[model samples]
Target: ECDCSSPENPCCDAATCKLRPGAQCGEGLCCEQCKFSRAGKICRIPRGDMPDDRCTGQSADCPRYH
Candidate 1:
């Protein structure tokens, strides 16, 4: 079975089985209002940020540190 119980996965669920409607995490920016998002659904704030951090936009997608 799919193990989405981990804190890391929010959109996934074991009880209801595979991505419920009411769950807080429906994936992310691409996912909203219980929709699959289906690419280019108008990004939030419109920023090409990293895959993890949606806040700060570094020189590129992957953020780094010293």
Candidate 2:
């Protein structure tokens, strides 16, 4: 299993974190997590400067979502 317990880098072992929800680690725009909104599934801000949206996206790194 991989690891990414650190927040400064927020880098986790792809093999472990990549398949988890709300655990995404990397650059570029990402979903991070999801939340129930008036519209529907919306992206939730996890941490860092990563912008979160209440629209379409992916959570290949979120440790938990649902």
Candidate 3:
């Protein structure tokens, strides 16, 4: 089921799309989706976890959707 919304409208990655974290940014599955279109070259902001913890690294798993 595809969303017929406008391209500008936020949408999830295509079924065939495949993205990887710490990898090149292009058209594919986003391991971490961008917060918005403005944030290019990088997506998947960091959240949760304390300042000093094992999960301090950028690759640490975090909640994507609220």
Candidate 4:
């Protein structure tokens, strides 16, 4: 069963399961536009264990949908 309400898989207006406009995929912090955003892309400010955590594409885990 597919949930159209999910932001990562909306289907109301899009007519197909996909990421909403300007929406980021839960797949990764860098996942956007249904693909890898960009390597070493700055996503959020410093936090957690690292002083400067950035966005990174989940190539292996990505493209799992479309």
Candidate 5:
């Protein structure tokens, strides 16, 4: 399930491309994901085609033991 304007090259649409803080895509698949770090929010394909396991600031900011 991918969106490709052409077979040779695939690209993510603006709708799916936008990722909220702590939100991610391209998990176990080939796509784009949004991530946060010292550099702030960034969207790109993860290394090794794996999902980004980076901690979510939204959740981490106020974590619940439960």
Candidate 6:
């Protein structure tokens, strides 16, 4: 069995978090996420200072598009 319920647990003994949606740690991804749009799945943020169409050109909204 997974020995995760101990005080000496080193990140769950293997950095394994419980099975849940978005619980698995991943590269370039943090443990926290906020989906402002109810678009079903989590929308990945638009990157870079300049972006293409698929999102609004507004400052805050631009990050949501791209």
Expressed as tens digits, the lDDT of each residue in 1-66 for candidate 4 is: 222346444422255555445454424455654456776666666446655555556431322111
Residues 1-66, candidate 2: write the lDDT tens digits.
343444333454445443245444343233332221232344467688665545334433323344
Error of 2 at 10 (Å): 1.8
The digit string of per-residue lDDT tens for model 6 on 1-66 reads 432344343333244433224222111122222112222333244468544333222111223332
User: By TM-score, highest first, what's the ranking?
Assistant: 4, 1, 2, 3, 6, 5
Q: Compare the candidates by TM-score and give the number of the best one.
A: 4
User: Which ten residues in a row are the worst by lDDT in model 4?
Assistant: 57-66
Taking all chains together, each candidate's TM-score versus the true structure is 0.29, 0.20, 0.18, 0.40, 0.15, 0.16
lDDT of 5 by residue, 1-66 (tens): 443333333133444443333443323222334322222233343559554443343321212222
lDDT of each: 0.41, 0.40, 0.32, 0.47, 0.33, 0.29
TM-score between candidate 4 and the true structure: 0.40
The clash tally of candidate 2 reads 10
Candidate 2 overall Cα lDDT vs. reference?
Answer: 0.40
> Which portions of model 5 show Cα errors greater than 4 Å?
1-46, 58-66
Decreasing lDDT order of the candidates: 4, 1, 2, 5, 3, 6
Give the TM-score (vs. native) of candidate 6.
0.16
User: Which 10-residue window in model 5 sums to the lowest lDDT?
Assistant: 57-66
Each model's total of backbone clashes? 0, 10, 3, 0, 0, 0
Better of 1 and 5 by TM-score: 1
